[PDB]
Amino acid sequence: QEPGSGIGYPYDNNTLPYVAPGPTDSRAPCPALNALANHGYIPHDGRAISRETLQNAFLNHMGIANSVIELALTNAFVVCEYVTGSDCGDSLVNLTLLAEPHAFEHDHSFSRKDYKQGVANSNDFIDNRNFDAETFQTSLDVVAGKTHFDYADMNEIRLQRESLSNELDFPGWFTESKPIQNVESGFIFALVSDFNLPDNDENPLVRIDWWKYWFTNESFPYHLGWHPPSPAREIEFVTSASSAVLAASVTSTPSSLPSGAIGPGAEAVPLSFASTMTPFLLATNAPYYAQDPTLGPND
Numbered sequence: 155q156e157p158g159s160g161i162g163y164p165y166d167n168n169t170l171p172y173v174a175p176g177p178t179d180s181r182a183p184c185p186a187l188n189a190l191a192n193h194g195y196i197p198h199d200g201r202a203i204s205r206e207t208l209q210n211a212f213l214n215h216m217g218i219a220n221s222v223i224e225l226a227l228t229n230a231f232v233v234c235e236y237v238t239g240s241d242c243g244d245s246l247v248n249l250t251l252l253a254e255p256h257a258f259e260h261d262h263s264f265s266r267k268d269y270k271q272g273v274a275n276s277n278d279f280i281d282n283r284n285f286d287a288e289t290f291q292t293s294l295d296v297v298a299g300k301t302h303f304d305y306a307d308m309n310e311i312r313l314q315r316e317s318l319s320n321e322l323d324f325p326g327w328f329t330e331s332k333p334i335q336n337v338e339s340g341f342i343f344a345l346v347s348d349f350n351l352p353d354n355d356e357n358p359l360v361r362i363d364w365w366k367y368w369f370t371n372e373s374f375p376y377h378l379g380w381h382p383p384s385p386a387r388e389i390e391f392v393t394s395a396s397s398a399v400l401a402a403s404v405t406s407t408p409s410s411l412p413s414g415a416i417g418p419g420a421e422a423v424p425l426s427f428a429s430t431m432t433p434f435l436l437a438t439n440a441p442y443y444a445q446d447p448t449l450g451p452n453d
């Protein structure tokens with residue numbers, strides 16, 4: 155928000171306004187990075203981004219401690235080298251390259267289509283990067299008519315997404331990614347669980363309206379009473395949440411799940427790509443921004 159608005163106070167005492175991305179700006183497949191860039195906490199053009207810029211933006215504007223993004227930073231820079239063909243040092247070339255498929259970006263996302271979802275032909279690909287309202291509605295509808303949800307519900311959401319993706323993706327494309335996705339499940343609990351409930355830290359419940367605002371608008375739900383978690387969330391919360399999602403008992407099983415879907419997940423680890431592997435072409439679509447309605451500077 156505008157700095158004088160005080161909308162962030164006393165959790166964020168140095169806010170900047172929302173500015174929609176323009177056609178030439180670079181955006182990510184990540185709703186968090188996109189919100190940060192839209193506010194200029196990382197470059198509004200989405201280019202030439204250092205580790206410390208990312209660390210400070212998450213810590214000071216989202217209540218997310220450095221530990222939470224340590225592996226994500228490693229993997230962002232691995233993917234940058236893979237996509238560009240050279241070491242990117244400490245200047246991430248852009249955010250768009252993070253949508254390189256079967257890498258950090260993965261299938262069965264909550265709010266994005268898959269790279270070969272619904273394609274009639276094998277060499278074809280689609281936008282696996284921008285927010286997709288229909289896809290996100292498939293996640294939301296698992297928890298329809300509710301204001302909050304728990305770990306077991308999140309497990310059902312990710313199972314629904316895996317099912318749909320396995321059914322809709324071009325045969326042979328679909329690749330399950332439980333470890334990365336369920337770190338992101340933990341990220342959702344870390345950011346938009348309801349800290350106004352007495353047992354939040356131990357039994358977090360996602361507030362659905364906060365989640366929906368964040369993802370649809372790529373800005374922060376201050377108007378709904380959200381603020382950055384204080385103290386900032388740490389990696390233990392995130393991986394504990396990830397564990398708890400996958401350990402929750404499944405009471406509704408979709409058909410078409412890949413082998414081993416129900417059960418614990420491997421720890422997320424650093425990515426690596428063979429030097430002789432050429433990257434998949436990135437989708438070139440302009441960055442998404444909310445238009446129904448468009449957002450003002452304080453939204």
Ligand code: HEM
Pocket residue numbers: 183184185186187208212218222223226227230252253258259260261262263264265266338339341342344345
């Ligand atoms: C340097 C830090 C980060 C990097 C490089 C990064 C990168 C990514 C990438 C590549 C994806 C796409 C995965 C996919 O859905 O196919 C993604 C998704 C996601 N990220 Fe980030 N991320 C970072 C930090 C965070 C943080 C701290 C949060 C929130 C606390 C967050 C929340 C999410 C969520 C919830 C998704 C899943 C979106 C969906 O499935 O529709 N990210 N991120």
Ligand SMILES: *[C@@H]1O[C@H](CO)[C@@H](O[C@@H]2O[C@H](CO)[C@@H](O[C@@H]3O[C@H](CO)[C@@H](O)[C@H](O)[C@@H]3O)[C@H](O)[C@H]2NC(C)=O)[C@H](O)[C@H]1NC(C)=O
Pocket residue numbers: 178179180181237238247248249250251433434435436437
């Ligand atoms: C974010 O950065 C990435 C990585 O640099 C950009 O993707 C790359 O964009 C270049 C054009 O600037 C593409 O190069 C072209 O490739 C074709 C096919 O090989 C070649 O014939 C052309 O002469 C040219 O070199 C490159 O393919 C593309 N990389 C991938 C893997 O798709 C991306 O455009 C940047 N996005 C934004 C919004 O800044």
Ligand SMILES: *[C@H]1O[C@H](CO)[C@@H](O)[C@H](O)[C@@H]1O[C@H]1O[C@H](CO)[C@@H](O)[C@H](O)[C@@H]1O
Pocket residue numbers: 437438439440
């Ligand atoms: C991205 O741009 C490429 C050319 O720059 C196209 O060849 C791709 O098909 C892809 O097109 C999509 O996004 C661009 C934005 O640059 C739109 O102009 C197209 O209409 C399409 O949505």
Ligand SMILES: *[C@@H]1O[C@H](CO)[C@@H](O)[C@H](O)[C@H]1NC(C)=O
Pocket residue numbers: 163164165166167
């Ligand atoms: C915001 O400013 C107030 C008033 O000085 C202060 O009490 C509070 O600790 C500040 N918040 C942060 C995150 O620094």
Ligand SMILES: *[C@@H]1O[C@H](CO)[C@@H](O)[C@H](O)[C@H]1NC(C)=O
Pocket residue numbers: 363366367368370371377444447449450453
């Ligand atoms: C997006 O933000 C606008 C402006 O604050 C708000 O009216 C709208 O409800 C938000 N969208 C969602 C889905 O939360």
Ligand SMILES: *[C@H]1O[C@H](CO)[C@@H](O)[C@H](O)[C@@H]1O
Pocket residue numbers: 389390391392393394397421422
């Ligand atoms: C989540 O999981 C990690 C291991 O991946 C632990 O280090 C953490 O304490 C939490 O249990």
Ligand SMILES: *[C@H]1O[C@H](CO)[C@@H](O)[C@H](O)[C@@H]1O
Pocket residue numbers: 355356357358390391394395398
């Ligand atoms: C790890 O931490 C999470 C968040 O505090 C808990 O919900 C979980 O039960 C485990 O203790």
Ligand SMILES: *[C@H]1O[C@H](CO)[C@@H](O)[C@H](O)[C@@H]1O
Pocket residue numbers: 393394396397398418
């Ligand atoms: C979360 O918890 C599970 C089991 O409780 C662990 O296997 C995982 O490593 C993480 O600590």
Ligand SMILES: *[C@H]1O[C@H](CO)[C@@H](O)[C@H](O)[C@@H]1O
Pocket residue numbers: 402403404405
């Ligand atoms: C785990 O527990 C649920 C009930 O919470 C069962 O429906 C499921 O079969 C599994 O035993």
Ligand SMILES: *[C@H]1O[C@H](CO)[C@@H](O)[C@H](O)[C@@H]1O
Pocket residue numbers: 306307310404405406
């Ligand atoms: C069984 O229970 C789980 C968790 O309580 C639900 O998410 C599912 O829809 C079914 O009712």
Ligand SMILES: *[C@H]1O[C@H](CO)[C@@H](O)[C@H](O)[C@@H]1O
Pocket residue numbers: 403404405406407408416
């Ligand atoms: C749906 O069905 C699967 C097995 O096909 C169970 O593991 C799950 O708990 C749910 O009953």
Ligand SMILES: *[C@H]1O[C@H](CO)[C@@H](O)[C@H](O)[C@@H]1O
Pocket residue numbers: 296310311313314405406407408409
């Ligand atoms: C229980 O929930 C699962 C996962 O969302 C569905 O696939 C199933 O049809 C039932 O509603």
Ligand SMILES: *[C@H]1O[C@H](CO)[C@@H](O)[C@H](O)[C@@H]1O
Pocket residue numbers: 332333334335336337340392393394396397400418419420421422
């Ligand atoms: C989230 O974190 C847990 C604990 O490391 C994993 O088991 C899960 O697969 C996901 O990465």
Ligand SMILES: *[C@H]1O[C@H](CO)[C@@H](O)[C@H](O)[C@@H]1O
Pocket residue numbers: 425426427428429
């Ligand atoms: C990481 O691991 C891959 C193999 O998965 C190697 O090809 C790469 O050079 C790096 O050691």
Ligand SMILES: *[C@H]1O[C@H](CO)[C@@H](O)[C@H](O)[C@@H]1O
Pocket residue numbers: 431432433434435
């Ligand atoms: C990268 O580019 C090579 C050709 O240079 C392809 O063979 C490979 O599948 C990938 O598309």
Ligand SMILES: *[C@H]1O[C@H](CO)[C@@H](O)[C@H](O)[C@@H]1O
Pocket residue numbers: 447448449450
């Ligand atoms: C986004 O842009 C529209 C005009 O298309 C305005 O009506 C709205 O208030 C916001 O500025």
